[PDB]
Design an enzyme around this catalytic site. Sequence first.
Site, PDB file in Angstrom:
ATOM      1  N   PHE A   1       0.831  -1.184   0.000  1.00 18.06           N
ATOM      2  CA  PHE A   1       0.000   0.000   0.000  1.00 18.06           C
ATOM      3  C   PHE A   1       0.880   1.252   0.000  1.00 18.06           C
ATOM      4  CE2 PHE A   1      -2.402   3.253   2.360  1.00 18.06           C
ATOM      5  CZ  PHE A   1      -3.566   3.272   1.624  1.00 18.06           C
TER       6      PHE A   1
ATOM      7  N   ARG B   1      -0.618   6.766  -7.797  1.00 16.77           N
ATOM      8  CA  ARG B   1      -1.921   7.422  -7.700  1.00 16.77           C
ATOM      9  C   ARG B   1      -1.908   8.735  -8.456  1.00 16.77           C
ATOM     10  NH1 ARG B   1      -4.876   7.126  -1.782  1.00 16.77           N
ATOM     11  NH2 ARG B   1      -5.245   4.862  -1.760  1.00 16.77           N
TER      12      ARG B   1
ATOM     13  N   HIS C   1      -8.676  14.615  -0.990  1.00 13.97           N
ATOM     14  CA  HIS C   1      -8.516  13.582   0.027  1.00 13.97           C
ATOM     15  C   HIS C   1      -7.699  13.968   1.257  1.00 13.97           C
ATOM     16  CE1 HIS C   1      -8.320   9.458   1.482  1.00 13.97           C
ATOM     17  NE2 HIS C   1      -7.003   9.539   1.531  1.00 13.97           N
TER      18      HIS C   1
ATOM     19  N   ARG D   1       2.022  13.597   0.221  1.00  8.83           N
ATOM     20  CA  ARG D   1       2.103  12.736   1.379  1.00  8.83           C
ATOM     21  C   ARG D   1       2.048  11.295   0.887  1.00  8.83           C
ATOM     22  NH1 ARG D   1      -2.627   9.617   0.902  1.00  8.83           N
ATOM     23  NH2 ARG D   1      -3.122   8.622   2.919  1.00  8.83           N
TER      24      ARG D   1
HETATM   25  C1  FAD Z   1     -10.761  11.094   4.740  1.00  8.41           C
HETATM   26  C2  FAD Z   1      -9.871   9.879   4.799  1.00  8.41           C
HETATM   27  C3  FAD Z   1      -8.539  10.038   5.214  1.00  8.41           C
HETATM   28  C4  FAD Z   1      -7.665   8.920   5.283  1.00  8.41           C
HETATM   29  C5  FAD Z   1      -8.122   7.623   4.934  1.00  8.41           C
HETATM   30  C6  FAD Z   1      -9.477   7.470   4.518  1.00  8.41           C
HETATM   31  C7  FAD Z   1     -10.341   8.544   4.444  1.00  8.41           C
HETATM   32  C8  FAD Z   1     -11.763   8.335   3.998  1.00  8.41           C
HETATM   33  N1  FAD Z   1      -7.323   6.497   4.988  1.00  8.41           N
HETATM   34  C9  FAD Z   1      -6.031   6.641   5.385  1.00  8.41           C
HETATM   35  C10 FAD Z   1      -5.172   5.483   5.458  1.00  8.41           C
HETATM   36  O1  FAD Z   1      -5.545   4.370   5.189  1.00  8.41           O
HETATM   37  N2  FAD Z   1      -3.866   5.692   5.861  1.00  8.41           N
HETATM   38  C11 FAD Z   1      -3.385   7.002   6.198  1.00  8.41           C
HETATM   39  O2  FAD Z   1      -2.247   7.080   6.528  1.00  8.41           O
HETATM   40  N3  FAD Z   1      -4.173   8.073   6.149  1.00  8.41           N
HETATM   41  C12 FAD Z   1      -5.468   7.949   5.758  1.00  8.41           C
HETATM   42  N4  FAD Z   1      -6.282   9.028   5.712  1.00  8.41           N
HETATM   43  C13 FAD Z   1      -5.895  10.386   6.111  1.00  8.41           C
HETATM   44  C14 FAD Z   1      -5.835  10.280   7.695  1.00  8.41           C
HETATM   45  O3  FAD Z   1      -6.968   9.561   8.180  1.00  8.41           O
HETATM   46  C15 FAD Z   1      -5.731  11.671   8.308  1.00  8.41           C
HETATM   47  O4  FAD Z   1      -4.605  12.405   7.854  1.00  8.41           O
HETATM   48  C16 FAD Z   1      -5.709  11.567   9.832  1.00  8.41           C
HETATM   49  O5  FAD Z   1      -6.807  10.794  10.368  1.00  8.41           O
HETATM   50  C17 FAD Z   1      -5.716  12.987  10.377  1.00  8.41           C
HETATM   51  O6  FAD Z   1      -5.797  12.884  11.960  1.00  8.41           O
HETATM   52  P1  FAD Z   1      -6.075  14.099  12.787  1.00  8.41           P
HETATM   53  O7  FAD Z   1      -5.826  13.581  14.228  1.00  8.41           O
HETATM   54  O8  FAD Z   1      -5.254  15.170  12.427  1.00  8.41           O
HETATM   55  O9  FAD Z   1      -7.463  14.633  12.574  1.00  8.41           O
HETATM   56  P2  FAD Z   1      -8.994  14.119  12.580  1.00  8.41           P
HETATM   57  O10 FAD Z   1      -9.062  12.790  12.839  1.00  8.41           O
HETATM   58  O11 FAD Z   1      -9.700  14.690  11.394  1.00  8.41           O
HETATM   59  O12 FAD Z   1      -9.640  14.870  13.737  1.00  8.41           O
HETATM   60  C18 FAD Z   1      -9.755  16.324  13.811  1.00  8.41           C
HETATM   61  C19 FAD Z   1     -10.462  16.629  15.154  1.00  8.41           C
HETATM   62  O13 FAD Z   1     -10.547  18.083  15.270  1.00  8.41           O
HETATM   63  C20 FAD Z   1     -11.861  18.406  15.832  1.00  8.41           C
HETATM   64  N5  FAD Z   1     -12.039  19.794  15.404  1.00  8.41           N
HETATM   65  C21 FAD Z   1     -11.878  20.308  14.137  1.00  8.41           C
HETATM   66  N6  FAD Z   1     -12.104  21.616  14.078  1.00  8.41           N
HETATM   67  C22 FAD Z   1     -12.429  21.980  15.358  1.00  8.41           C
HETATM   68  C23 FAD Z   1     -12.782  23.280  15.956  1.00  8.41           C
HETATM   69  N7  FAD Z   1     -12.844  24.400  15.292  1.00  8.41           N
HETATM   70  N8  FAD Z   1     -13.050  23.248  17.309  1.00  8.41           N
HETATM   71  C24 FAD Z   1     -12.997  22.100  18.050  1.00  8.41           C
HETATM   72  N9  FAD Z   1     -12.683  20.872  17.589  1.00  8.41           N
HETATM   73  C25 FAD Z   1     -12.404  20.859  16.230  1.00  8.41           C
HETATM   74  C26 FAD Z   1     -12.764  17.391  15.251  1.00  8.41           C
HETATM   75  O14 FAD Z   1     -13.955  17.247  15.982  1.00  8.41           O
HETATM   76  C27 FAD Z   1     -11.907  16.113  15.318  1.00  8.41           C
HETATM   77  O15 FAD Z   1     -12.133  15.287  16.403  1.00  8.41           O
END
Ligand code: FAD
Lengths: 655, 55, 254, 254, 239
Positions: free
Chosen positions: A141, A301, A369, A404
Amino acid sequence: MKVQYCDSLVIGGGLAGLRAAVATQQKGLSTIVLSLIPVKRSHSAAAQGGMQASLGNSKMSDGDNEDLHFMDTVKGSDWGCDQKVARMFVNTAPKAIRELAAWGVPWTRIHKGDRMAIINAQKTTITEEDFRHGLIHSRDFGGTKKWRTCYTADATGHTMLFAVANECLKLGVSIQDRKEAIALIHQDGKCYGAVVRDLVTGDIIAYVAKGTLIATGGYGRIYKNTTNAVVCEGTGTAIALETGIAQLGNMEAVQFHPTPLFPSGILLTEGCRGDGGILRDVDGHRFMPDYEPEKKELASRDVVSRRMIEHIRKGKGVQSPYGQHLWLDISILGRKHIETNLRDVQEICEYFAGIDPAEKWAPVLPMQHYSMGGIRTDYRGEAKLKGLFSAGEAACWDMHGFNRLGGNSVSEAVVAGMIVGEYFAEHCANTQVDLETKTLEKFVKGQEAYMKSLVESKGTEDVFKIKNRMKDVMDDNVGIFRDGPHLEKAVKELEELYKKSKNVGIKNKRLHANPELEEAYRVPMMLKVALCVAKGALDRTESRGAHNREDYPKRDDINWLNRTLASWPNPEQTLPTLEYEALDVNEMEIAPGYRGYGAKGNYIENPLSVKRQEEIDKIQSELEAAGKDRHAIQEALMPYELPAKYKARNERLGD
Amino acid sequence: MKVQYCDSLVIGGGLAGLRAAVATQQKGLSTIVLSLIPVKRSHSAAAQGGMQASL
Amino acid sequence: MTNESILESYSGVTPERKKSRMPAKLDWWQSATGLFLGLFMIGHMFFVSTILLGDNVMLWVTKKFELDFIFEGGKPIVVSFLAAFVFAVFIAHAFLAMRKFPINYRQYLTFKTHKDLMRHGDTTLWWIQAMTGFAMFFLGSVHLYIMMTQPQTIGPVSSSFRMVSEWMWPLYLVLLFAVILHGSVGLYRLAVKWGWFDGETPDKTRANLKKLKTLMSAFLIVLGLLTFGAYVKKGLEQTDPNIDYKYFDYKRTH
Amino acid sequence: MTNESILESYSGVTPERKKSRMPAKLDWWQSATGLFLGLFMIGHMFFVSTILLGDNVMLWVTKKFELDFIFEGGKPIVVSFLAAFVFAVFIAHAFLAMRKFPINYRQYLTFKTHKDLMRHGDTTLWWIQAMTGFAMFFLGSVHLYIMMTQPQTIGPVSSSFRMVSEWMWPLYLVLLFAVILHGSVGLYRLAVKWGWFDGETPDKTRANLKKLKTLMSAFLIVLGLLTFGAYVKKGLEQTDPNIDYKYFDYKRTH
Amino acid sequence: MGRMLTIRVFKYDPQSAVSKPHFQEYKIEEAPSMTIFIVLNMIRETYDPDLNFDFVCRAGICGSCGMMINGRPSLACRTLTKDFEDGVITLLPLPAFKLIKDLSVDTGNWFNGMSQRVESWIHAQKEHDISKLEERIEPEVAQEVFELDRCIECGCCIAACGTKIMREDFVGAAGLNRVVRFMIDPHDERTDEDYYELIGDDDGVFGCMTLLACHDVCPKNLPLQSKIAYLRRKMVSVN
Ligand SMILES: *Cc1cc2c(cc1C)nc1c(=O)[nH]c(=O)nc-1n2C[C@H](O)[C@H](O)[C@H](O)COP(=O)(O)OP(=O)(O)OC[C@H]1O[C@@H](n2cnc3c(N)ncnc32)[C@H](O)[C@@H]1O
Ligand SMILES: *Cc1cc2c(cc1C)nc1c(=O)[nH]c(=O)nc-1n2C[C@H](O)[C@H](O)[C@H](O)COP(=O)(O)OP(=O)(O)OC[C@H]1O[C@@H](n2cnc3c(N)ncnc32)[C@H](O)[C@@H]1O
Ligand code: HEM
Ligand code: HEM
Ligand code: HEM
Ligand code: HEM
Ligand SMILES: CCCCCCCCCCCCO[C@@H]1O[C@H](CO)[C@@H](O[C@H]2O[C@H](CO)[C@@H](O)[C@H](O)[C@H]2O)[C@H](O)[C@H]1O
Ligand SMILES: CCCCCCCCCCCCO[C@@H]1O[C@H](CO)[C@@H](O[C@H]2O[C@H](CO)[C@@H](O)[C@H](O)[C@H]2O)[C@H](O)[C@H]1O
Ligand SMILES: CC1=C(C)C(=O)c2ccccc2C1=O
Ligand SMILES: CC1=C(C)C(=O)c2ccccc2C1=O
Ligand code: SF4
Ligand code: F3S
Ligand code: FES
Ligand code: NA
């Protein structure tokens, strides 16, 4: 006034946020985690590809190590990443897996024997020795030669996130959901916390801390078509940008996935192509070979996405009521192969596309993405605004550059969470803060005033129509292929859209549980974020990583071996302020060269690259001959930092 | 470290403390009243002579 | 009240600071007693339906329970104990299962609404279990006291006498549907609750047990309705005012 | 299920955003039904004890209920309805009061401990109310079905026959103590719960009602024990195998 | 036209004194591959931006959109209008959860509470070293822990459970499943007596009435039925 105090404030409850919260709580720092939604529902839970880490356990992993992983990452980034950070990463990734393993993450294991395997360079069989049995497995992958993507069946993100969230509960971290950070508190260039809106009660509360970390995820929903969850709107990024001090890095560096389900955008894992999936056009024609005779639908990709867009432009795309798409044919893999290896892909198509992937073709199209861009930080994770840190996709720790690596993002979330978590913890324990009520009051009363003004606006603009128009502009002008003329058109319109967004009027007048009011203050933030991506995409006259400028096809290593830095110092300005941080080749362990995928010699070579390259060859050979391990050699080429806790080497099978 | 913030902190839940707490809360000041025991058990409850006032 | 019970009451735990095991024991016995009454009814349905095979069989069965093969014409008093024992179990089971009834307006309202909304089988069946069980508080108690206090009045004639001349058929008719729906569903649930027959394909196992449940009910209902008619007709043919039908069967072998 | 019931279930309030009045109605009926059964038993104790005044009286009473003064020898079927009505109320009351039983290990444990610790009268009496009431689920149901389905077998002879030859005395003996302790305490509590007779000195009023409660119990128990013996002796004197005692009283005036 | 769908929605704002429980209807024209996610957003952006509801992944992964769709607790984003031969779809917020407003309830905090109550985390005396080879686990064991660890805390099995609707302290299906998930995990050192101290009471495993509605509505088809039974047998044998 309502004030909540904690030593360490964490905005974001995804992998990066929660892991960082563990790092600060475990060492006696009272920590709060703020989140829009329950933390275990973060977008991180959606990951199904896997996590990249050089364990070297499996047969196809044998020989793998920090160096190989590091290189894929740097060449993958097209040299836009901070190689030192990338080193910090690859080195800690192995121990992130093992720690998660110790925490219960049900990683798929290796079992002695031969297995049916697809290498499509030889769809032969693989043998796993007996001494490999029971160790953490890996899958093909991300296009890396070495198979190092670890996974927990088909729900890797899910299980990973749950373990970290549960550790947070175990350590007694304060998880406060349905709470949104709408502004950062700062004075004299230092961050003292954030002004928060309770999404349920509507109360504006000030959360003060000695250190604040933003782990808010990506800004993918500024596009109409994206794989992202509906909560990835970049507001985390926005509130940082709105301080006028912190900077955003490479916001124009957006990555697309080639096979999301059309038009929902629900992801169809890369395993479809890898296992044999076929891309077809309106006539049912397998076209990838037309463009990539060699790799065909197994090209990187980046390439596939471009080809799919080219083909569509050549008028061979399918006409649909939601736009043009192409077809993904996995049926040719057989029914038995899908119901056992892609049993989850079969559910996606049925539940959301109303089709059996083993009988029909799935409509697909490239879509937004991952967000390489984010809040710019140093190797420790701290922004230009002192006391404010960032980790995960919301940041630009920069180990991704302009592309990335598949499997590196969830990996980064946990890893950065561990490393930035340490630096963050240290900052919080050591720094001493001066909290002035006059300032807290200014910011809290400030946002209360704002909410009130929104509820009372007689403006006639519609927030949704404004928001939707923005995502169309971004999709049509800031996608896979970009050219100056169109980018100027987009920037101009986004800027106009921003101005009209301030004349929005909303029907519902209440201050509590008001989704309309939420959109009212969020869209304007989303627009300032889009402007940084669009305008930064316009000013970068070159083609690097995911950034493809048709009018500037070659990667310019002379004028663009830098990093875009966006800021908004004047609240009255209507366009982001851009600056550039030059990447110093003399600090690179690997000099700019060919990336591996795509055309060749497609880059204006920088003379200092060559000079540096020798310096590399020289120093390497002298030590390599003088009997020196890869470790000592690395230290001689580019010394990097790491918190004491993660300085240890990674034991591997066959040591 | 544990920190609690309020605009007006009142140490004591007797007649003087509670009445003062009313004066600050009624005008939008978030106020906390700290007490060794449930406030309505303060020594003030023991008074049986009466309250002097020129009606 | 003992110190331990005082300590448990006031501390929420046992003297060793562990949670009581009573809930476990109580749960066990509820199933045990339920299981006993369940099996008992299966058998009971057969031995009572022997009248479809002629009075000689029925009478033969009746006599054996009174330990015919040990005493003169058999001492009916045996049946008195047999009945007392079942009654006690009957009481105990009701006392334990009773804990599971909805018990106030809110519970009753929200659960009834939910049931109608859900249109979910196994949930609806539990409601039936609750109902029928509540109904038997009255229906079952009646039958059990008679068999216990009038064991010498069991027989093709005597039983038919009570059924008709003493107006038991209405009660019997209802109790028949009640105890059978209750018992068979209770048995089905008893099986999926403890998973005795789960195996590697619990979903397939459960699916079978459901078909099995329904079948058992239909069979016992039809059989029970036939046996019912049997007793009814005979009773309706006891017109001679000079014949003492109530004790006719007893007046054969003492 | 109706929309209002869906809305109430899910919102916790009525469509007008007010709390249901059901709890009020439910509380009312529990007392009403309890009060009816209470008074009924007082009267019942007298009209059943008339046998201490000779078979002619008893028989006279028996006949009047069958509306003697309207039909030939009086249609027993009248008693069937009279009984069905009381049975229904009996069911309803149990169904409502049932809500008040302790209903799990914890409740039962902590309350029992508390009772023993408190050594408080009115609290202990409620436990009795709970017990006796639970006991009547079985005891009461039996009696009620017979009177309802065998009204033509009431009389100094017939009743005495059932009492002894049909072994009802054991049940009757227990039910006697049960329903009387239950009923009189329930009446006493019913009075202090609604305070019908509070006045200006509730403490004095309550004190009286307690003495009254005890007295009523003693009287009815003694009376009931006397009436009991009466029926017992007569039954024990029915030795002639040629006499049909069960329907003897009926066989006088049809 | 795709056919007119009548959408009946439960609306109620407990934080507003003037609000009262009632239903509201919307007329939406069905479209291809239309889901309730699409519908609710259509209604929000063009008919009534008052309506509250929680969506996140819109891909049946996060468990955010659980709600009652025609009497059955299920995930809105994964539900297709096309499956309703009537065109009449009624939406209610999940019962058994604190209602925020309209179709929005608080499942997240109940779950965090449920997670703490069952101490949902690995319990081990010695902390393994993260720089050394991970401990070996049989692939089959890993697969099993995964199967139960797939729970996405959508709350559907809680809202489907009549028992929990009646007795709110009931730990629920999801809670019982969480225990077994750790019970069968070699990494966790707790014994049966340990788990007994967690769910060994009437609010725990013995509170389950085997309604099985949970097993029949679980969007991840977790082996709830047999797994709950497994746990009951083991807990009734402690001492
Ligand atoms: C969209 C996606 C991404 C993805 C993937 C499949 C999909 C459908 N598969 C992946 C994979 O197999 N391998 C990999 O390495 N990456 C993959 N990705 C990307 C990856 O999942 C992301 O880069 C990663 O999950 C990012 O993690 P991060 O910890 O940074 O962020 P998050 O999970 O999105 O959570 C963000 C949190 O922030 C809170 N939030 C956001 N804005 C606010 C504000 N303004 N105030 C308060 N809280 C906030 C959200 O609620 C959330 O919990
Ligand atoms: C003792 C007494 C006094 C008295 C009286 C009869 C008795 C037995 N009868 C009186 C009367 O008829 N008329 C009258 O005018 N005065 C009478 N008095 C005296 C009068 O009651 C007192 O002067 C008056 O009640 C004092 O009121 P005050 O509001 O000041 O104080 P309080 O009721 O004692 O409550 C003190 C509160 O402080 C809390 N506390 C104390 N130390 C701490 C610390 N270290 N930390 C936190 N809380 C603290 C106590 O808990 C209490 O609530
Ligand atoms: C001969 C008659 C009876 C039979 C055949 C019988 C049998 C059963 C069976 C097989 C069960 C399963 C118990 C378990 O799951 O552990 C059950 C459940 C139940 N029974 Fe009975 N029963 C009888 C009488 C009664 C009576 C008199 C009551 C009245 C209180 C009653 C109330 C209940 C209730 C409410 C349940 C459900 C308990 C639960 O879900 O936990 N039963 N019975
Ligand atoms: C030791 C206990 C029991 C004995 C000795 C017994 C005996 C009998 C006998 C001999 C009859 C035939 C009619 C008659 O003689 O009046 C009968 C019928 C019946 N019994 Fe029982 N029984 C017992 C327990 C139960 C229980 C616990 C139930 C369920 C609550 C039950 C339900 C019925 C029903 C419904 C019939 C009607 C059969 C039909 O018409 O199909 N019995 N019983
Ligand atoms: C002819 C028989 C009965 C009589 C004379 C009778 C009478 C009464 C009376 C006077 C009350 C007062 C109710 C109130 O305070 O509103 C009472 C309470 C009660 N009865 Fe009965 N009852 C009868 C049968 C039953 C039965 C079959 C049950 C079984 C469920 C039962 C269970 C209860 C309970 C538990 C209470 C206490 C309710 C409370 O404290 O709220 N009763 N009854
Ligand atoms: C319309 C309803 C009722 C009728 C027609 C009725 C009739 C009778 C009759 C005639 C007897 C005399 C013995 C016999 O004939 O077998 C009797 C005795 C008795 N009844 Fe009732 N009864 C009714 C309701 C009740 C209720 C609800 C209870 C309480 C649960 C009750 C408790 C008793 C007791 C304990 C005796 C024994 C008297 C003694 O030995 O002192 N009765 N009943
Ligand atoms: C299924 C057997 C139940 C076991 C018995 C114990 C639990 C149930 C009783 C305890 C709670 C009291 O239950 C209360 O009864 C009254 C009946 O007049 C119900 O009343 C409601 O249903 C009844 C029956 O369909 C309707 O005629 C009535 O118009 C309606 O308002 C209340 O909604 C219920 O809450
Ligand atoms: C007073 C009538 C009660 C109404 C019926 C409904 C409420 C009571 C039953 C529901 C709860 C189950 O009740 C449970 O019964 C068992 C009886 O084996 C009791 O067991 C305890 O008391 C019994 C009786 O004194 C002892 O023989 C036993 O050794 C002791 O451990 C439990 O402490 C009680 O909690
Ligand atoms: C269980 C039982 C018992 C105990 C009997 O004495 C009896 C007597 C006559 C027919 C059926 C039965 C019967 O089924
Ligand atoms: C209430 C009652 C009823 C309804 C009777 O039919 C009857 C008949 C004979 C003695 C006492 C009674 C009696 O007490
Ligand atoms: S067990 Fe099933 S229904 Fe229950 S929360 Fe988990 S995934 Fe949802
Ligand atoms: S529906 Fe509830 S009663 Fe037990 S079987 Fe599932 S948790
Ligand atoms: S929106 Fe995530 S499961 Fe429905
Ligand atoms: Na980023």
